[PDB]
Symmetry: D2
Subunit: 267 residues, 4 copies
Amino acid sequence: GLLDGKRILVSGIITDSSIAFHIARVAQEQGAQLVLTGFDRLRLIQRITDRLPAKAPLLELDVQNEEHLASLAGRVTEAIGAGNKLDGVVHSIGFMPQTGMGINPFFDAPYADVSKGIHISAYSYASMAKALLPIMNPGGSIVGMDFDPSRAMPAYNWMTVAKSALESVNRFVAREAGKYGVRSNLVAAGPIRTLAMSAIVGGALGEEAGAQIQLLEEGWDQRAPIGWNMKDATPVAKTVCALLSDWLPATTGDIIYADGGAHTQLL
Amino acid sequence: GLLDGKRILVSGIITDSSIAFHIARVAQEQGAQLVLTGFDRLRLIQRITDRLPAKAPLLELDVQNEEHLASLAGRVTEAIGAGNKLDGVVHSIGFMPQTGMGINPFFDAPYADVSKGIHISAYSYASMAKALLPIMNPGGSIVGMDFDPSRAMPAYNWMTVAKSALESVNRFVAREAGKYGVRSNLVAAGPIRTLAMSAIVGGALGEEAGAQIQLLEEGWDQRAPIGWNMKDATPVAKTVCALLSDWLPATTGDIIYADGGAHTQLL
Amino acid sequence: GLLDGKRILVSGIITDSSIAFHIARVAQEQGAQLVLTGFDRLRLIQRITDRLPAKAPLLELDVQNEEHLASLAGRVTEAIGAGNKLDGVVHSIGFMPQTGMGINPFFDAPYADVSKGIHISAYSYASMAKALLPIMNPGGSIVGMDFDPSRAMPAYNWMTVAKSALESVNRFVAREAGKYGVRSNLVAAGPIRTLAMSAIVGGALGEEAGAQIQLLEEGWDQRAPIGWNMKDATPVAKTVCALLSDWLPATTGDIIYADGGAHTQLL
Amino acid sequence: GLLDGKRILVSGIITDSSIAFHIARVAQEQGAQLVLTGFDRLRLIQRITDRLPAKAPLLELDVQNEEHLASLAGRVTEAIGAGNKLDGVVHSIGFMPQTGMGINPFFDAPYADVSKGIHISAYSYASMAKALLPIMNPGGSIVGMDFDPSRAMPAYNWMTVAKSALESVNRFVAREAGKYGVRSNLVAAGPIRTLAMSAIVGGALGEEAGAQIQLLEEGWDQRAPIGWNMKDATPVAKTVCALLSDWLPATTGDIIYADGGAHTQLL
Ligand SMILES: NC(=O)c1ccc[n+]([C@@H]2O[C@H](COP(=O)([O-])OP(=O)(O)OC[C@H]3O[C@@H](n4cnc5c(N)ncnc54)[C@H](O)[C@@H]3O)[C@@H](O)[C@H]2O)c1
Ligand SMILES: NC(=O)c1ccc[n+]([C@@H]2O[C@H](COP(=O)([O-])OP(=O)(O)OC[C@H]3O[C@@H](n4cnc5c(N)ncnc54)[C@H](O)[C@@H]3O)[C@@H](O)[C@H]2O)c1
Ligand SMILES: NC(=O)c1ccc[n+]([C@@H]2O[C@H](COP(=O)([O-])OP(=O)(O)OC[C@H]3O[C@@H](n4cnc5c(N)ncnc54)[C@H](O)[C@@H]3O)[C@@H](O)[C@H]2O)c1
Ligand SMILES: NC(=O)c1ccc[n+]([C@@H]2O[C@H](COP(=O)([O-])OP(=O)(O)OC[C@H]3O[C@@H](n4cnc5c(N)ncnc54)[C@H](O)[C@@H]3O)[C@@H](O)[C@H]2O)c1
């Protein structure tokens, strides 16, 4: 296995179409031993993760909760056994209140809503690194999920701002993680049809937003020299595993694009 | 004058070494009629602005205050006369609590502090545009101040994250401002010895931070093919005026670098 | 005038729809004294430039000719009067053999053809700077024309490669020009309907190429928050003049986008 | 092995300190079957490659020779057996005449010299893809070696221009390779002490150039959050293998940085 022998924490599973679900599956398929973290709906998450090809302890983590973060490393050591450390950490967490996205005008998102989304989507990447670096091995790897924010786009609005912040946060985390011999990188994925995304295409955030996202997705597949399949999260999961492995040992504070190559093409 | 006939709002004056002070002076020298906004220390700001070559009404604006923002456009119309509109807006506002900068570890900044700094330094750019676009003329120009955050740097820490967010916010504001025939751009300046900056070089934020900033400044002048004078804000002020003029009419959602060309050179 | 008192060399006029024609007109309108250079069809170019609002000496310059380059500075001093120096230089020159563009497959362009196009389109920017820097004043400005090559696009093929090279060349020229107190920058323009461009939309380079360029142009106007008018070179000409003026005195080795803001937006 | 079962062509071995030598070794260690190409000194190259952990046919390829390129695919099919196709191609080829580098002024490089270097260093990436795509399997991978040219640097001069061109060429090759289900990417490596590099540090290209390169190398290790060891090409070789594997299946037309993370940090 690509990840034979590695212990890896994976956050952000909420359904079987979560990107993190597929990351965890591929990791296990490749020999990794996992510990999982979940937010709020733990009974639901345990039931969902029963389907992973191997068993994995599930810990609760609300990244807005300072007590969960304070105790996190202790709980992970319990789950993996004293004297053992993590080789990998996957941050697959994101959220923006509805007022910060969709047909709600960009200017009408209240700061308290934006702030919550930046807290969960960007700041928390630093939070998790802080909690977990003290229990990671040299040669370890932290990975977060990015959506390319270098240009503005319809509908995504404040979530795109949050991703811009996350990319900057990642460059600082690399500085800190480096002292532990640990790498920190983001994977910028193409659009993937998770439950939330389908809901949005379905009009959950307004009809104009839905039309624009659908148009965004189609342009993506068209631009990608190898195509893009929004229904298949597997190529994204493999890329995260590549970064978790020993095969990109000199890459840190960086962004790997798993997007079909769409971002390298104009038309 | 470059700005003959234009009405321009300029925020962010707090001392005579403020970048906004120099922006206002050059603007007046070039024919602009100004309205100013100031935060908290209004008696002090009025006394400082008495030195500008022309008189200009001073309005109070705390960008964290929804009532100031709600009433802002009304107060500006009063100051410039009903039936008159702004041709320009200068956002020169920034702040990060001390815990988000300097030798205080990156991981130790509490979210409430980071959030305040992102509110003032990034979100407020959207806030001001929202308040002011309804009273701007076609062909108008909004300009904000940026410090190039595309790479991590010592000491600047969470302020750099805030600037990453601001750059993303600027691209969205351009989308909105475009409907009014208005441009939105940032100026990325080299480091300038304002009062705060000198204090930091002096060790106000820890000795290690001060040493790194001083080293940052020296490397800048060295890399800049035309040099960089941290004691002279004038070349920055001129660049902002260039963007306020009619001479960059097809540039928007963009960043103009006034940094001596330092960012284009590695060594 | 924005350029009152400045002496400026402007290359690249071949017809009245040339971008350089419009650059020269706006410059003269703003007080500049011009010297022009033309390639090959000098009788035609003189007849075209008779229409400029002021008279200007026309010198012959084939940038592939080492003797023209060797003698250039001497001929310019003759035209503007001994003891006088240039304040500005405009490089508006570009060419790629047909085999390097359009429906001719990317892989089928012979190196000799690509090389000719890189010579004229990229190397020559360094050539002109070398010839002219010895006769420029401190505070001077060199400007070249760019088409944003950071992403691949249909049809433009090897010309896009040439522009990638030009951007890199510009960063080096800034290093050299800096010793003379001279700036060097590119303007990245949106697509403009010159004679060549219309011919291409008309199918001169194959029907598939024409269809793609037309589609490129439409997407541009759509993405640009302030729109893009491919039939109007004026906003581009003004931007070049902005860079020729004293109003961007700390910008060098850089790229200014005059493209309606299209490159800052994804959809 | 990471590359179990894959057939891979590797160019650019000239000594045992060549980056391509280390790429080939790691590939073989990971299960790949190799075919090698060499330029000019074939007796020397065969003797050097005898040290690889497995045997591999050596073919002659001068990328400036149209007959070598025309016959290349035929010769590779012979070496790997009719009915067999390549899964991978490594372009590790670069050259710039001495006049285009070092203390020789940037402006003094003659175009014929620059052109030769762009031919070998940039155009040839397209040349090799053209020759080899007809004999590659779906899911295949082409990889080239890059040195980050996004900013100008002392000494590297026209070689940096060549790399700028190569990055642009790579984005076009991805467009073509995509039709075959093949990816195309570059690896941007930190500086590595090959024979040529040591010679340059030793003053082979002038003392000023040597001093600047040495200073470049030191700054690199300092900026890299995980450090950079210029004497160890292994982390670069692993990264190339990562791209040759099935573990980055949605990345194309892109650049992966194997540079210690140096390019993500300012100071
Ligand atoms: N779906 C896409 O098209 C797309 C594309 C690129 C990147 N991404 C990113 O990938 C990541 C995963 O998203 P997804 O598409 O798998 O969506 P998802 O809804 O399946 O998962 C998002 C996860 O974030 C968790 N979360 C929300 N608030 C939390 C908090 N307070 N504490 C802990 N966890 C919290 C949710 O429980 C959920 O598990 C996100 O960062 C997203 O921005 C998504
Ligand atoms: N000084 C530098 O080296 C440097 C470099 C590049 C960019 N910048 C940016 O330029 C801008 C101006 O900074 P400066 O260097 O002139 O510093 P400064 O201290 O002189 O001005 C900052 C201004 O922000 C104002 N401010 C703070 N909180 C506010 C709030 N709640 N509401 C309204 N105003 C508020 C302050 O009153 C002050 O006037 C900032 O955005 C800064 O980040 C500074
Ligand atoms: N038209 C567009 O959509 C567009 C967009 C962005 C940038 N540009 C760039 O603007 C510049 C001007 O192009 P244009 O659109 O005005 O086209 P144009 O055909 O009007 O002008 C190109 C000029 O280059 C000159 N030239 C060709 N070979 C030469 C040589 N050997 N020596 C001296 N001059 C030579 C021609 O005489 C002509 O005057 C070019 O660099 C072009 O790439 C064009
Ligand atoms: N050494 C570094 O610090 C560094 C850093 C980043 C990228 N790179 C790149 O890595 C690649 C390999 O370089 P290296 O450092 O291993 O140097 P090297 O000298 O060991 O290898 C360069 C190879 O290019 C070959 N070559 C030259 N002309 C050729 C031609 N006409 N046809 C076929 N082959 C030809 C040479 O035979 C040699 O094998 C180059 O592209 C280089 O630019 C090098």
